[PDB]
Design a protein around this ligand. Structure first.
Ligand SMILES: *[C@@H]1O[C@H](CO)[C@@H](O[C@@H]2O[C@H](CO)[C@@H](O[C@H]3O[C@H](CO[C@@H]4O[C@H](CO)[C@@H](O)[C@H](O)[C@@H]4O)[C@@H](O)[C@H](O[C@H]4O[C@H](CO)[C@@H](O)[C@H](O)[C@@H]4O)[C@@H]3O)[C@H](O)[C@H]2NC(C)=O)[C@H](O)[C@H]1NC(C)=O
Length: 361
């Protein structure tokens, strides 16, 4: 089984213990570590942070301890305008320029592959995305003639039914990608004024209409559209989504007024690292959706939807049972990487729980 783990650049800037550098990463934890995110300049792949080539080097030295570890560099991301990706892929010339710049860059910095985080292709992009994947893979096939191990090509893809139908030709890109990471953790959000979980495993026979916003539906749909289970990797959260309640009600459907108050370390409204949630739990009331198989907690007027060791192990068994290639974790810097916030002296409790199940039969 594969255990794909993302590490984010901007996490080096968090204060105190929140600060996370590549060397905090256990070399034997994951099978693949992906550095997010690279940028695109003058239609060529490029660094993002001022110290990226230093962090690239730090990350890739982990391979000195675990020779089987593979690393990839992810291009795109949220702070990367989808339109920008759009313009690059639409024209044969700018596309070909981008494709040619990738191998040397990866070879120079020591990466084993490229991860595409085009978020998200619209209706007009579908055909170009296919073109980008095909041609990028062909270039990787060509570059390997030089005697070096062929570069890997992966992509992070929406788990939303409508997003999938709109921007992806799953049957086509599946044959060219080494693995597809399903972003099965964006099923709810603070864009809608009600309380709900962003990463439920199952539908839940209650207040419905979605019936598509759960990991089980997403996996099934991808398999039906033509993607081989052996290339699918299910995404597992290491963060939680928070809400500010508009009333004293805490159960399903509870009125929301906006995002939750920022965490001391992550400083972003609407989300909390798992290590911040461990602290948040002291004095909070914990609950669990029986049907969806995921937990949530409340304290004062704060409502948090998150994943714990049990829900994550649960998700891992589910993907083993559907015979998928593995799991993807977003992100290592959001898990209790120091291992000093969550109680049981253990580094990366969430990611380790996934690994244990995967190492199981
Ligand atoms: C990721 O990679 C992207 C893509 O390269 C970077 O984004 C580009 O970065 C530069 C610097 O941040 C920006 O450059 C240029 O801005 C001036 C022109 O911008 C115009 O802005 C007006 C808006 O009022 C708009 O009407 C025009 O359409 C145009 O966009 C330009 O004059 C600036 O300067 C130069 O001027 C002369 C050469 O003409 C030279 O003497 C100077 O030294 C200098 O080179 C500058 O070049 C650009 O606006 C920005 N655009 C995009 C696509 O975002 C990112 O910085 C990268 N991200 C990270 C984190 O690095």
């Amino acid at each position: 089984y594969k255990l794909i783990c993302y590490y984010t650049s901007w996490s080096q800037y968090r204060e105190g213990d929140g600060s996370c550098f590549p060397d905090a990463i256990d070399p034997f934890l994951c099978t693949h570590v992906i550095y997010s995110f690279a940028n695109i300049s003058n239609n060529e792949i490029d660094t993002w942070e001022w110290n990226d080539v230093t962090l690239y080097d730090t990350l890739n030295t982990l391979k000195n301890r675990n020779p089987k570890l593979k690393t990839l560099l992810s291009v795109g991301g949220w702070n990367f305008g989808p339109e920008r990706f759009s313009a690059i892929a639409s024209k044969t010339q700018s596309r070909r320029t981008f494709i040619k710049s990738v191998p040397p860059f990866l070879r120079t910095h020591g990466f084993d592959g490229l991860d595409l985080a085009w978020l998200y292709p619209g209706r007009r992009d579908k055909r170009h995305l296919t073109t980008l994947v095909k041609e990028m893979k062909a270039e990787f096939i060509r570059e390997a003639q030089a005697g070096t191990e062929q570069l890997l090509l992966s992509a992070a893809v929406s788990a939303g039914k409508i997003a999938i139908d709109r921007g992806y030709d799953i049957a086509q890109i599946s044959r060219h990608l080494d693995f597809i990471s399903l972003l099965t953790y964006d099923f709810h959000g603070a864009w809608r004024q009600t309380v709900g979980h962003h990463s439920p495993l199952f539908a839940g026979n209650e207040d419905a209409s979605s019936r598509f916003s759960n990991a089980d539906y997403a996996v099934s749909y991808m398999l039906r559209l033509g993607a081989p289970a052996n290339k699918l990797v299910m995404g597992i959260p290491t963060f939680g989504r928070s809400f500010t309640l508009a009333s004293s009600k805490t159960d399903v459907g509870a009125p929301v007024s906006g995002p939750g108050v920022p965490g001391r370390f992550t400083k972003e409204k609407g989300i909390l690292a798992y290590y911040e949630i461990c602290d948040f739990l002291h004095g909070a009331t914990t609950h669990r959706f029986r049907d969806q198989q995921v937990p949530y907690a409340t304290k004062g007027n704060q409502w948090v939807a998150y994943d714990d060791q049990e829900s994550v192990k649960n998700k891992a068994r589910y993907l083993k049972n559907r015979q998928l290639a593995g799991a993807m974790v977003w992100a290592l810097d959001l898990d209790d990487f120091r291992g000093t916030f969550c109680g049981q002296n253990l580094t990366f409790p969430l990611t380790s729980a996934v690994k244990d199940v995967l190492a199981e039969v």
